[PDB]
Each structure stands twice: as structure tokens, then as C-alpha cells.
Amino acid sequence: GYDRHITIFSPEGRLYQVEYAFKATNQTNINSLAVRGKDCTVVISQKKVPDKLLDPTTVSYIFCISRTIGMVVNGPIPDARNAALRAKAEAAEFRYKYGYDMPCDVLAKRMANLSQIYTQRAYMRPLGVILTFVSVDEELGPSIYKTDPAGYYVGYKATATGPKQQEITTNLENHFKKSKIDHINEESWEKVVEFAITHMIDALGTEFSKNDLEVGVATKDKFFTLSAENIEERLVAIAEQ
Amino acid sequence: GYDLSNSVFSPDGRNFQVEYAVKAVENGTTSIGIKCNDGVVFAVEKLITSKLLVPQKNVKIQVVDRHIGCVYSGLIPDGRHLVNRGREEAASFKKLYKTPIPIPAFADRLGQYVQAHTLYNSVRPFGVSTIFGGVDKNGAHLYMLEPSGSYWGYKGAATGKGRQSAKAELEKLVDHHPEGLSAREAVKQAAKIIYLAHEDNKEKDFELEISWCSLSETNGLHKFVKGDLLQEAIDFAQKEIN
Amino acid sequence: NNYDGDTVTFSPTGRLFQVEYALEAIKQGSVTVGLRSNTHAVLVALKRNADELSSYQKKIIKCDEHMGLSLAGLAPDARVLSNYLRQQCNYSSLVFNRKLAVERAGHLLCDKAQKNTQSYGGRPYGVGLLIIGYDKSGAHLLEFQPSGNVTELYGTAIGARSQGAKTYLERTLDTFIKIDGNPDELIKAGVEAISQSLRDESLTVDNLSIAIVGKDTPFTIYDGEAVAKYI
Amino acid sequence: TQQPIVTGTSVISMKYDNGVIIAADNLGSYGSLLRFNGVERLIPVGDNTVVGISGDISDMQHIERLLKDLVTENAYDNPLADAEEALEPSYIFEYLATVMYQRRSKMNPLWNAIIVAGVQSNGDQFLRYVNLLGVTYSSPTLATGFGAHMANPLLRKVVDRESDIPKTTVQVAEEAIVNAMRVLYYRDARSSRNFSLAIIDKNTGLTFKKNLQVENMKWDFAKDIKGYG
Amino acid sequence: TDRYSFSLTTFSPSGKLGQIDYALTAVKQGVTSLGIKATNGVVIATEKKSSSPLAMSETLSKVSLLTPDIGAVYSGMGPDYRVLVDKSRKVAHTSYKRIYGEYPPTKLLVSEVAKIMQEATQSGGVRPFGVSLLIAGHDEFNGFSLYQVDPSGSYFPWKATAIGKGSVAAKTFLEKRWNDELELEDAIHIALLTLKESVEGEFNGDTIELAIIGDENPDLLGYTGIPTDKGPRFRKLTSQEINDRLEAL
Amino acid sequence: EYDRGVSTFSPEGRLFQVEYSLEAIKLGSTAIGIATKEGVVLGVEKRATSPLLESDSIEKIVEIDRHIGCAMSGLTADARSMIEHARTAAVTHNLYYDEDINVESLTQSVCDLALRFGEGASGEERLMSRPFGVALLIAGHDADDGYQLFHAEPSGTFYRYNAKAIGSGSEGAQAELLNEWHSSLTLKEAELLVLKILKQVMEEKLDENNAQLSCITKQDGFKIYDNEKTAELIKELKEKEAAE
Amino acid sequence: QFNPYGDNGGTILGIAGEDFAVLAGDTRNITDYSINSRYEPKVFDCGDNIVMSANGFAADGDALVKRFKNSVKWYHFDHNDKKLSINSAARNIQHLLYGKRF
Amino acid sequence: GSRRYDSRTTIFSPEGRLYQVEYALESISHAGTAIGIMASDGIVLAAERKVTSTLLEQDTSTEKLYKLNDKIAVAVAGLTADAEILINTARIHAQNYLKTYNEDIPVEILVRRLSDIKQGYTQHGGLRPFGVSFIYAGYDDRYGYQLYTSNPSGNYTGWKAISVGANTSAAQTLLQMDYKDDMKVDDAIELALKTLSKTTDSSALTYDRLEFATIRKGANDGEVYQKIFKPQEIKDILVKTGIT
Amino acid sequence: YDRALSIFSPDGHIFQVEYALEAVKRGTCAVGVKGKNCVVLGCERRSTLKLQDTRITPSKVSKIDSHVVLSFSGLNADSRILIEKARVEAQSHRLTLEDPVTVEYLTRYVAGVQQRYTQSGGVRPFGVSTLIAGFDPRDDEPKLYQTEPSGIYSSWSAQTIGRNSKTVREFLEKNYDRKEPPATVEECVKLTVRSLLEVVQTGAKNIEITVVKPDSDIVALSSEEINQYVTQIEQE
């Protein structure tokens, strides 16, 4: 039938058109992992550069929405830039009319509504990207919120994305069962980066380089990105543990 | 099924209308772009379908701004319209911020635009890949834009029937200069690999066009290559393939 | 009825099929041939009556005293483009105190058709224009496809049996460019070019319609017993 | 609405037999207070036109946008669309005029007065005047502002008719322009001592002579009188 | 263009608007939620399900506030409810906080929200939302009320009801436990006991969302010192408190 | 298929709905038009489809203005909208210039209306999704070209004709038009010629209760003839069939 | 404040002949007691043997002539090289004036 | 596409009949019965719900009965949901009449308006009609008490007594055989209950499944007082007529 | 919305026109006969079922003027819209132009409503055929027109539209002259009655007669007045 081609219910009450949107984020072979540190939130993610003729410095899956909130995207790159733009406009919007920078929580909720609106029309294609927003807020503390094509969102202790993300998830769950708290204790954010890399290497079974990773760090009142050199520093510190 | 619009989606995770649009450019002209240190050098193969034409009158190289070169391949009317919109964008930025738009900024905006027409069944996508770049205060930049709305950083890029022939040579050219290379020398290069990508267009004949934006010669403006420099390049490429 | 009932759907062949169908209007349609030197441009059009008790239909539209267009396809589609070109040409005179240039008017036209083929429910225009004119750059002769794309030539044709006319113009190509300052010769050669496009459609003195533009000559349409100076 | 807010002074200009000359001082005054000096008002377009803009400085910026915009729009579509579709001072003139007119209709004009001074491709002299109203005219000798009746008469003293343009040379004109700028500075409160000078020639292109000062003033008779009378 | 202004709701050749029937199916694929009306309060309860074990159910909201004295809870699709609760809040503000000023009657607001459901079954480019809402509330005019909003765009008052995949079993459960006079405490016990049978996971108080529109509480308003004005009659129960309640079933 | 769409080709290479329009001129009652340089005559067939039909106030002769006349044949619901637009066009010229509008240019003005198919192409306000199904014989006199007769199509294309016959019997009438049209006709010989060809395709009898004549003339204007005159010319027609 | 009128003066004179017409005007342009320019005629030919002078305020005066020449063009384009009557011209110009009477 | 996902739902059929309207009448026969009877002292509106559940509260359910204004109420038979929109449109149209003319709206006007909306849905927009049938109790000063029934097509027909909803056949005939024109409110109150007990979708008619309402002229001065009875008063009158 | 419901049919027709005319067949049946001094529009009233009040059943003949009426055949829902729209146009003429309307004016107006929704897309035309009858003021000539949902109008001097129009037409062929209308009002009324008793049936229950005479004389005659004429008709 044609309840699978436009976003109208079936005799099960299911929107098949929407479900397909999830099925496309595995096609770029990008994984991400994001954990809440002690005073930071770190997200490490794969960077695929299949050629020389692609310049690696430009291949970015990390878009700064706010000064304080980073966004890492898993899935097709057109929809990524589209989603980034909407989110940037809305963050600025709220700063203008409410006199402070938009909460991470409220931004996640916002994109969830817009996602629902793209599945409310019957000629609009859902934005298939899965979005991770990472922040350190001053009211909610360290935060991860992952929104999805359907327009469902929920908070997160930690999260992973990609075709191979079950393995990553298994690792993280076991860690927080030994530690019995919802965020990694350490006290130098640098060592939380190092820890995150170790779990990733275990999960995907591959050691990464400084151009197989791209790393984003949110500390208090800020988000920035590590350069490829900083990442190589971390991989020496794997030796040092 | 799943081949009647651009807002169906398949269980495979694929949009075929959009993928199919890349094939449009695959039957287009060969066009290359060499990312340099000082700038960029574009070159485009112009097919000759008769000898009634007037060579270097049929433009595919349109300048957008006073410093961004744009040259496109695929369905021609479509690409001229894509450039049409981008000139409006250039003026708008200049009006509000009083400075010419940057190279990365222009790349961004075109990506949004090509996104829009694959999200509605009420507008038709484009059928072109465009190659554009220039010099700004962040350096030289080179970008290729798919009709899917995808772009990346590019050391070297190509598209058209002979995109394979072109790209194979660009790999070797990074072997020759792993430090990148000068714009002025890349003019001669640019001709070379269109002649090599005319071996996929070897039942036709061609006219070579070359355009450059480089900070070391033209003061960072996008200009054409013509006259004495042009014929030096034409002669170079000939002797090599002979 | 997948890609041929919609004007919004691709096509892994990188087409829109409608444009090909709109190009078949030219095969069934009339024929007109343009050729230029460097100092004059000329259109020779084959006029066609509806029956023998009908006056033959004019196929050349004057857009300005430096510009003219001619159709070979559907007339109602041509009616939109004739208005548009006149509007833009008068706009150029008003605003920039300029003639409008030949290349540039083609570019405006191209992107016009494109956004009506983009919009769903629209149509691609099925009439092919030859746009001639004389501006600062000299003469120009553009071929306008139903795609909308514009091409610059010294001589071109479209319509039914346009292929033979390009053979003829490619052979006399170096002849009529190195004749300058005499529009007459070009017209004689143009008659010969459209005679490679007959199918017993004969050329008479009321079938033949000529239009020229020069540096010293306005846009002028010759008809009547005044086209029999070149027969 | 729009009344004068920040207001420049005057542009003076004349023809000679092989080009034209044009000059202006660097001022945006705020009444008797000369609030901004060093404010540039001569703007070159190519080496074939210099445009002198007088009137309000706010509106001057909105025509500097439009001049940039004009060059880019002419250069768009063919790389041969600015070489032999080349801009003429007449084309630049008409553009600004017509836009300005429609903006005046909205009752929010582009409050300026412009002289467009150039040379053609054939090398005829082009010197013409437009303003916010849309009042146009030609003269061998032109000015804007208070200079319309202040400085301009001295220039027009040499050239009473236009069959006398070829009898005016570069070095007769040059002298008169320097002096008319001195008259302007003498007898108008709003003006500057700093002045810029351009020469548009069709045998050298544009030669720009910046930041000349008003010299050869006469003041020795400013001390042979004691009292107001 | 815009050629989607033909309704995507139609009738079937056997009667019965087919689209809202499909939308009603999605509620039986949804989570279970229930409301028991007492005679001195109302209780609403739902279960939290997530697609991850690393997901936070501490930033997950399936019971949401419309106005201090009125709460809502769904069964059905998550995304649909996420936009729909915002539209409920928006009409309540633009038509009863800028026009009538005060917080609306429960009866009023229920009617207004049903109109939006109706207007997603009229127009093109929109098919209706596939959740059912329980809107519990209290106004000082019509007393305590518990209503159920349909994906058809109708409303019904109930004495006690459930929505979700276990709705049919739940109303059979409520038949014998229900009485015309109830306390609010006893209502809590009945509500959670019915929802324990409509969950097939583990039944915690950390993963069960409880809220009462029961006793006023002033200190949740934001100010004190005028007692003629109160704070929210809605009061969400924190997790540790719900754990105490699991023992009170 | 392709006539299920509003603007779609059609492996033929031209639109389909347009064809079916041309095959709707065969649903009308004949309209015949003969032009000379003494006036142009339009005669029309009113056609009794019922014996209780009153046919003496049904008119398919319509005035556009004093110097331009029109006859319609085909489906005449479509023509009702067209006659209103044409009337406005003529009057607009007379407002803008206080001058007579040419016949050619008027027909062109109505041809612009015939152009409206498609729904999202050009910048105008689209007020159908289909072309018309009715053809006009617009007759007239202008001061430039002299006397003129035009045929307007639901295509949006026009041709100047010297004789045209449209309607159900268009082709069998036109066969006769080719032989019998000559330049020595006068106003009145053209009039009898209408009645001659009209009688062949008249399914009942020719008389003045199912036919009406009208002329457009420079020196008397637009005059629709009364039934007396029509009847007299019909009696004079039968005397030339007895001279054969 | 902004007042968008003025008086740029000049004078024109039109005389109907037998088979001729003369339309004359001065070339002096002024803006108060100022003489802006000695030379700027104000009688322009519009083609087809209409001559037009719109005299008084220069800005409006130039506007009229432009728009009228545009109309001349459209006349030849849509009535198929129609001869433009003096008479026809007059009515058209009146519409241009009445259009801006607010 | 966009014409690719529309099969055309709101055209005529080859009997001249709208697909969507015909389907609608069937879906209203699924919904509970509602009967209207007009006495010469009043109008009785009586409605049986289409839902009755395990623990459904029907003691305050005002889900079939709505006051449009203080002299016009409706009984609803069809989708309750669909009906909502038109119920509030009707409130607005009624209050508008009072606001501008300082007078209560006639029954005729109010119904004719709502019918127009229904007709409007299949006329334009591609939209479906609401599957609703209304029975209107209304008083005006020009036809006195008026009774109307309206259907999803947008047409109104007068009645003396009429039934909608489930089992219209059975109900209609019994009403014809038993109704007299000199009945009162008392008589009509009992007649409606007996008819609803032959059409009850359970095997018994219960007080909490009944909504019952009157408009009576026994209120002083000849004023009409509308009364929607309390659940204890419906139970009160149902034991009186001897069903329970 | 602009996706057409009007789409060209392979016979030079339009689907919605053909359907409209089908709906006119299936619907009510109106007969119109004009005398030398009157118009009679009689139309089927729908009251066949028992116990109905006929003052609140739809008006099948509606006066637009003081001497122009509008009658219809076809659907009973599509037709009310046109009645309302006709009234506005009549009042508009009287406001801005003057002069109680002519019948012809309103004939063309109703046809001009049919043309819009046919030629436009996203809309469908009314399935209603109309008898427009009445007088022009200052003229004593009565005028009978029909318009059909195609948008065509034609003058007649007797006409019928609706169910079994073939049957009604054949009766009027022997007992009506095209060139000599009735010279008496009572005979025009009785002739319209005799035609309606063919199709409709069942006494004078479902029969209506509206009479318009000049001097701006509109009277509606109730059914009981029509009984008396019917018995004379049967006796004869």
C-alpha cells in the first residue's frame, strides 16, 4: 500500500516512512561516543577520509550551535547541515528574546517538535540524521541529549551512535555498573578523553589515529574542538597508563 | 515504488531520485579543480558538436562575487539557475556586512539551497555538480557540490565523464608535490589532465578553457586565462599526449 | 506514467522527459534558419498558411530596432517569451540608457524557463527561438533550446529538417563571414540554406520572409514583392 | 521624510579638450561644527569614471553599495560582458538616477547631488548632473551644493559656450580648478582645508592626486583695517 | 507548489472514517497509562519506556503540565504528543490568559484541544495524531473532572479509565476496585496496581511516573503570604516516594 | 494518462487536451464567415434541437464593439467567458487611447486568455487547468489593414482567413469555400454565399427561424440583420439554383 | 522636512500650422535666481513625428518623456507597427499624468 | 508527485452522486439513534449514545445534547467528534444575529448556514464532509416551532417527527403509526421513549444511556424554556413510562 | 489546492459536466410553460413520505425579484448556493445601475457561475439546471429561458428538465404551439399541472404552481388550490 510512502498510519498504527529514516545513518559508517566526565562532556567520533584527494581538515561532523553546546551528527551530511542551521537559528532566537543562552534541554525539545512537524506533512521527508547535543549547563550540569528523526528525545547518561553502536553501549553500561554513578570520575578532562578512546577501541576492535578521530570537549561555559595534534598527544598517554 | 518522488524513502536507506541526479552530471563535461597554496585553478572541457560554434563564447565559467569562480557540468540550464541564485546571495551579504562574502560562507549557502528541492515534491532537484573556490583571509579553498547537497574539502576534484581519468592524475600530482604547488604552474597541469580526460571523449573533439583565482598573480580576484599564457598551456598538453 | 506524468520527477538518466517531448514540437513545427556575418545578422523564415484561403503566418517578431526573435514551435508558448524579452529590453533602455546585449537577454530567458519547469504543474516551453541582434559586440546569433540553454554560433537552424541546413552553413561558413558590409549576400546564402529543408513546402515570394539588422540598418522585416530581390 | 543630518560640501568640475577634471574636499559637517574631517567623497569606477557625490553622507553610503553592485551585475554572465559590453559614464548615470527617483516616490529619498564625470570609448567628454529630485542637466562647467553659484562661476568664466571646449587645455583648466576650490574654502563656512583632486584623461587613464592643501591664499589685507568701521 | 490541500482523512466504502481508526490502533501499540478519579483528587500514572539502557528517564516527560491545576498524560506515539502538548498550552494561553485572564475550567480546555484534533482531520498535508490523552483536572466550578480526548476529536468524561495496549484488561480490573467514594491515597494504590498488570517489564518507582492532581501545595507556586491564592494542585511525586508507594499496594 | 495531467507531454510531442479541444468544434452549430472589401459577413446556425424551441432570441452573434463583431461555434459555455474578456479588451483600448482597436490585436488579446493551461508555471494568475473547446470567427474592420476576418483557436493561435467555416460541417463547407471564393464578390454575393453553403449542412430547413445574418461594415457599423432581410435573401437564393 | 517640488523654469511655445507644426523652447535651466546651465534643450523628438516637451520642473519633465517613449515602442510592438496619432498620443499622456495625482 | 497520491475522492459518480456523501450515510447508521418529535406544546429531543462502557460516566455526559442558543438545541447522531466543529460554528452564527439585529436567529437561517458548509466541502478544496446528521429543535416567531433534519450532503427537510442514526427504518414506521397532531409534551415524552426501546443497541434501554431534553412552552408568558434533564430525573421519567 | 477535478475527456467532453447532467436527470423535475401574459414554473416538491410540513421543506421555486423567479432541476443541495448568489447579483444591479432586473440579465449571471468551476481546477461545478423566467420591466412580453450546468443558456417557449423529460416533452408537442402561447393564465397553469401529473404523480401533493403576471404580480398557489383544477382536468 501507500501508507508506507507518505506519513499516514497503517492498520497497526505505524508510520513506516518514518522508520526508514533511522535506517540511513548506517550508510556513512560513522560512530560516535559521548560520555559525561566530572566537569566536562567529551564526544569522540570517527572521521572517514577515504582518499588523499579529500582534505582531512574540512571533513567535520562537529557543528557548534552555541558557544557552549556542541553537536555531533551521525548520518547523511546534507541533512546534517540542514539540521545544524535550524538549531543555530533557534538558539540565537532564544538568546535574543529571553536574555540568556538557550538551554540544551530546551533545544533538544525544539528539534523534536520540528522533527514531528516534518512527519506531519505528507510531502515532507524526515531529516534522517541522528543528532547528539553535548553540553555542560549551569542548571542541569553535564548533559547529553540525543534527538532522532521521529521527534522523540530523552536525556542521556552516555550514548553511542553508528552501525556498530551496540558494542559500544555494552561497554559503557558495564562501566557505570561498577562505578555506580552516572558520570566518570577523574579530575582532568584530558584523562576522560583518554578513557573514552580506550572504550571505543575495545568496542569497534580497531585502534584509531589522529585523523580517524575528531574530538570535541565541552567544559564550563565553553565548547571547543581538539586539533589533530592534540589527539596524537592522547594516544601517547594510552601508553602511559 | 520509491521512484516516483523525492520524499519516498526506501527500506534500504537510499533515496534514488537523488542518487540518479548524480548520473546527470556523469553525462556532462569533464571539469577539474586543482587546490593550490595561493589559489585554485579550474579547467573545463567544452565539447565541440560541429564547427559552426564560436569557441570561447559559450560560457560555463561564471564569476560569483568579484573573487569566487564557479564552473559547472551536467544539465546546463539547471546549472545556470543555480549560479543565478548565488549571485543574489553575494549581493545580500555585501549589503548587510559591507564586505564580499567568504569562500566557506558561499559554500554553506549553496548546500542549503540544493537541500531544499529534494525535500518537496513540488520543486525539482538540480542536475549539476559545481566546482568553485577562491582566496579569502582564511586561505585558498576548493569545493565540489553534488546535486544531493554534499560538499567537502578537496585537495583536487573532478567530475564529468572523465572524472576517473582526471582523479588518477591528481593522486600522482600530490606525490610530485606533497607540499602542494603554485597556482602559476598549475595552469599547465590543468590543461594536461583535461587532455587525459579527453581519452574518454576520444570520439569527439574539444575546446579547452581555463580560469584561475590566485593571490600571487591576479591579486586574489577570479579572472580568465587567455592570450599568450593560454596558448602555452595548449601547446604543453598537446606535446605530452602526442 | 511514472516520470512522464510529472514535471518534478527524475530520471536516473539525468533527464526530464518532458523536455524531449517539448523538443518534438520542433520536428512537427515550422523551420527557420539564421546566419550572421560580423556586421549584419539575418533570419530567413518559412511562412506557412493554414490553407490556401489563408494569409501565411508571420514567424518573426520584432523585439526592438536592435533585436528580433523567431519561433519554430508552438505559438502560445512563444507569446510568453516575446512579451518577456520586450519587457527586459525596454527596461534596459529606461534604467541603464543602453541597448540590451544579445548574450545577456538569452541568459535572462534561460533562467526564466527553468523556474517554470521547476514548479510542479508547470510546463517546459516547446518553442525554440533564434535570437538575433546587433549590439556593441557586433552581431550575435543565439540558438535557444527547449531546455533553455543558449548557444552562440555564426549560423544555425532549428525546425523540421534543420540538419541539412547546418550542413549547408558549415560548408559556406568561411564564405559568409569574410563578406562584410553587404547584407545582400547573406540573404541569398540563407535562401539556399533553407532550401536544404524543403519537403515540397516550396519557397515563393509570399512564403519567404526575411529580417535583418545592421549597424546602419534598423531591424527590418522584408515581405511581399520585396523578398523577390533575393530570388 | 529625511532632512540634512551630516552633510558634505561641494564638487567642482570642468572639461578640457582631452578629458575632464573633478575635485572635492573631505568633509562631513554637522552644521557650523565640522564634525568629521577626512571623509572621502571622490569614488572611482574604473579608470574611465570618477563620481563626485555631494549632499548627505548617510545617503552617500547607500550609493557606494549601489556602485559596487552595478559593477558586479554588469560583470555577471559573460567574461566578455565588461570588456565590450564595457560600462560608459552614461550607463552609470542612468542607473543611479532612475533608482533614486523611485526611492523619492516612497517619500524617503537618496538625498544627494552627484556629478558623473568620465570619458567615452570614443573619447567624448561626459559631464552630467543628477540629484535626489531627479533634476538633470549638462554644462561645460558644473558644481553641486553652495558651489553651484559660488565656485562654478569662475570656471564658467573661461568657457562661455561649448564650441569653446577644444580651446581649453589641461593646464588652463588645472589652474582654474585649484583656484575655484580656494574660492569655495574662502567664502563657505562648511568646507575643509583638506581637498582631494582627480583627473580623468583619455590619454593616460585616471591620475589621482590626493590630499592637496588649499594654498596661495591671500591674507595680507587682513591687517590694514582697525575696527569694524 | 501546494497541491496537498485534499484531506488525508476519508471514509471507507463500509462507512467509518478509516484514518482515525488507524490512528486509534497506534494507541494499542502505545504505552499504558491510566487515570482513576477520586472524590477528593485525581491520579494519573504512566510507565516510562526507552530504547536504550543508557537513556535518561529523568529528562523524559510523559506526564506534563498544561496549567497549575490541570495535567495531561498520553498513550500512543511519543512524537505526536510532543508537538500536541505545546499546541494545547498555546491555545490555552492565547484564548484564556489574554482574553479571560485566569486558568480555564477543565471542561473548557478539553473542548478546545479536541478542536485541534478535528482540524488535523480537515485539510490536506495533515493526517491526525495517533495518541489518546487523559486530561485530569480540577476547577472550582464543575469540581474534579477526568476527561479522555480521542484521536477522533471527541471527549468523554470517565469515572476511571485506561488507554494504551492494556486498556481492555484495565477497565475490567477497575470494575471491582472502583467505588463512588474514594480517598486520594487509596486511588494511588488502585492506579499503580492496575498498571503493574499492564507492564511486562520490571515495575519500579524509578521507571514509573506518578502524578496527582490532588491536594494543593502552596510552596510550589513560588510565593507565600496570600492564602486566598494557591499553588499547583498538580504535584509530581519524586522517585523515592513512589518506592514507598510500591509497598502500599 | 497524459490527459489526466494538466500540462504534460505526450510522446507525440504536443499536448493532448488541446487535441480533444479541436474535436469539440464538432459539437457546435455552424458558423460561416466570408470576407470581402465591402464588409465582412458572419452568418450563424441557431439549430432547433426541439420543436418547442424558441429560436428568435438565441443569438450566437455577439458584439465586441461597434467596429468589431464576432460569431462563436463549438461548445458555447466556454465562449461566454471569452466574450466578456474580449469586450473589456476593446473598451480598454478606447479608454487608453480614444482610438479604434485593430481586429488582429483584439483577437490576440483573446488568444492570451486561451493561454492559461498549466498551474504553477508562468507568473500570471492561473484560472483554469485546461484549454477551451470553442472556436471564434472574429470579423471586423480596422482603418489600417481595411476589412479583416480572423479565426481564433482554443490553442491560443490565430490566423487571418479570407473565408473560414467552422462547426460540425466545417470540412464539407470548407471544400466548397475553396472553389467558390473569389475577389469579385461583393457584400451581397458574399451574403448569398453564406446561405448557399449553410443550406447544405442544415439538417432541417433553411429559413429565418434558425439562421441569423450579421454584417460588420465601416460605413454603417455593426448591424445585426432582422429576420425580414434574412428571409428575402433566402428567396433570392432559390432563383440561382433554378438558373443552373 | 522634505518638499519634493521646485521650479526649474524654462518656457515653451507650440504653434499649429497648416501642414506644419512648430514646437520651440529655450535651453536655459535655472533653480531660483541661479542659472544652473546655459545649455540644456528641452524639446525631444519621440519618433514618428511627435515632438514632446514637458516643461517646468525638470525631474517630472524628464520622467514623462521617458515613459511616453516606452509607450511608443509598445505601440509598434503590439499593434504590428501601428502609426501613432497625435491624438492617440494625447490620451496616453493624460493617463501618465493622472496616474500620479496623489 | 502530488497528483500521484490523489485518486480523486470528491468528484461525482456516474449516477451524479458524491462518493464521500454516500459513504457518510452508512457511517451515521453505525452511530446511535436520535429521535425528534414535535408536539403542539413543544419539541422533544431524545438521543441514545453510541458508546456505553464498563465504567463510562454517562451521568454528566453532555456529549449528544448541546444548546446552540437559549431557544435552539440539537440532538446529534453520527460522529460526536465530527459534529463538534459545526456545533460551535452554529453558536457563533446565532450570537452574530443577536449582536447585529437585536433578535434571536430563526431556525431556518441557522440550519441553512450549516448545510452550506457541508456543501462547501465537496464543492472546493478536496476536503471530505463531516459524517453527521442533526435533528434541530428550534423556536422562531415566524413558523413557530420548527423541526429539521440535515444530512452530510448539505440539504434540509422539514418533518413532524423523524429519526436518525441506527435503525431508522423501524423507528420511522412506528412513529408514523402512533403519532397524532394533537399530542402534547406529555404524550411525546412517552412516545419517544417507546420508539427508542425498539431500536436500542443493547437489549434494554437504561436511564444512563438516555439523554433526554425538551423545549416547553409551559414556561410563563409563552416563553420557551429548554431543559436538559438531570440523570435522576431521566430515571424518574423512565419508570413512569414503564420501560424499567 | 489546484489539482484539477476538471480534466479533458477523450470525447471532447469534461467528466464533471457529464456528471452534472446525470445529476440533473436523477433529481427533481421542473416544467416551464409561458403564456402571452404569464410564466408558470412548476417543480417537483419532495414530500412523498407521510406527515411532513411543506412550509419548511426546501423551496423549489425562489423569487429573486418582484417579477423574476428561479426554479431548478437536479440536486437539492447544490441548488441553494445558486439561489443565494442570484439574489445578491439582483440586488447589486438595483443598487449600482438601477432598474429592477431583467430576466436575461439573471440568465447570463447563472450561466456565468457554471463556467468558473468547470474551467478552473480544484473545484467542481454545480449539478443544477435552472428555469429562469419572468419579465423585463416596461415590457409586457414574458420570457422563458433554461440554463444547464454546462454554462449554456437557450431560450424556449415550453421546456422541461429533470427525470423523464422525454415523456413530458412528447405530451407538450400536440397540446402546445411554438408560435401561439396560451392567451389565458388559467390555461397555462392547467397545462403545467397536466405535465407534472405524468412523472411526479400522487395527486397535487407534490405539485407546485408559481404564477408571475406583469405589473410585478407574484403569487404562490398552495396545493389545495391546485386540487380544484385537477378535478376539472380529469372530468374533461
Side-chain angles (χ1 to χ4, degrees), chain I residues 120-186:
Chain I
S120 260
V123 286
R124 88 301 188 273
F126 296 135
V128 188
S129 185
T130 44
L131 294 184
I132 312 93
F135 299 78
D136 295 46
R138 301 197 277 294
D139 297 293
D140 59 38
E141 312 181 57
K143 299 193 203 88
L144 185 69
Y145 304 100
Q146 70 147 6
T147 295
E148 56 184 349
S150 337
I152 296 173
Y153 57 89
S154 258
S155 162
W156 299 66
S157 34
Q159 170 64 324
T160 174
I161 29 179
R163 274 196 110 190
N164 294 318
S165 50
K166 35 197 122 176
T167 325
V168 165
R169 182 179 288 158
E170 201 162 79
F171 182 63
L172 296 145
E173 183 36 28
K174 317 315 202 270
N175 275 330
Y176 193 66
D177 202 342
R178 154 189 194 198
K179 239 8 256 184
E180 259 205 296
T184 314
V185 183
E186 295 312 86

Side-chain angles (χ1 to χ4, degrees), chain D residues 1-20:
Chain D
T1 303
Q2 193 58 23
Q3 54 84 62
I5 303 163
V6 181
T7 295
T9 310
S10 301
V11 180
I12 52 157
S13 51
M14 62 184 294
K15 301 166 168 89
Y16 57 104
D17 63 351
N18 289 309
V20 292

Side-chain angles (χ1 to χ4, degrees), chain F residues 63-85:
Chain F
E63 197 172 83
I64 305 191
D65 69 345
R66 180 220 189 226
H67 50 89
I68 292 179
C70 176
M72 62 186 91
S73 173
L75 174 72
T76 45
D78 306 297
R80 302 296 171 201
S81 162
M82 295 180 80
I83 178 71
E84 291 227 358
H85 177 74

Side-chain angles (χ1 to χ4, degrees), chain B residues 15-171:
Chain B
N15 300 101
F16 307 163
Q17 196 156 116
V18 177
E19 234 170 308
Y20 287 165
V22 193
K23 298 182 169 80
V25 194
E26 201 56 88
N27 301 323
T29 47
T30 308
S31 181
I32 61 110
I34 296 168
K35 176 198 196 133
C36 312
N37 300 351
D38 296 12
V40 289
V41 177
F42 311 99
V44 63
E45 185 188 293
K46 185 171 45 177
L47 302 164
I48 296 180
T49 36
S50 60
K51 296 114 183 202
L52 298 154
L53 311 164
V54 190
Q56 308 177 296
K57 305 313 159 242
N58 301 308
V59 285
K60 297 170 173 349
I61 310 158
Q62 298 166 315
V63 67
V64 166
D65 188 1
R66 310 238 359 243
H67 64 126
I68 316 184
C70 308
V71 65
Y72 55 84
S73 292
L75 294 174
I76 300 291
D78 256 10
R80 185 152 295 133
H81 190 57
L82 180 64
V83 179
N84 193 11
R85 172 54 176 143
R87 287 162 346 193
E88 280 175 31
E89 292 185 23
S92 307
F93 201 80
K94 246 184 295 189
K95 191 188 131 199
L96 184 50
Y97 296 116
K98 281 285 241 296
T99 194
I101 192 158
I103 317 311
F106 178 67
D108 205 5
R109 282 207 179 183
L110 284 171
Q112 304 325 323
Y113 190 55
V114 173
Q115 189 55 92
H117 309 167
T118 68
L119 293 164
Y120 292 116
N121 297 349
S122 300
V123 298
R124 193 174 54 92
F126 301 101
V128 287
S129 194
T130 311
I131 296 179
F132 45 102
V135 184
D136 68 315
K137 47 187 73 64
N138 296 322
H141 309 281
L142 174 65
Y143 302 93
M144 177 159 102
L145 175 63
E146 305 297 291
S148 179
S150 297
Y151 69 82
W152 295 109
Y154 281 109
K155 301 306 316 314
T159 199
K161 287 186 198 315
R163 73 173 78 189
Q164 298 153 342
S165 305
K167 300 269 274 294
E169 299 137 307
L170 290 163
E171 296 207 96

Side-chain angles (χ1 to χ4, degrees), chain E residues 11-16, chain H residues 23 26:
Chain E
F11 294 94
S12 324
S14 323
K16 310 213 156 166
Chain H
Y23 299 162
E26 171 76 346

Side-chain angles (χ1 to χ4, degrees), chain D residues 11 14 19-20 50 108 118 146-147 150 164 170 175-176 184 195 203 211 216-217 221-222:
Chain D
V11 180
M14 62 184 294
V20 292
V50 176
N108 186 2
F146 178 89
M150 182 38 87
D164 281 355
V170 66
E175 273 174 273
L184 192 94
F195 80 104
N203 304 98
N211 294 341
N216 304 108
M217 64 303 282
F221 68 104

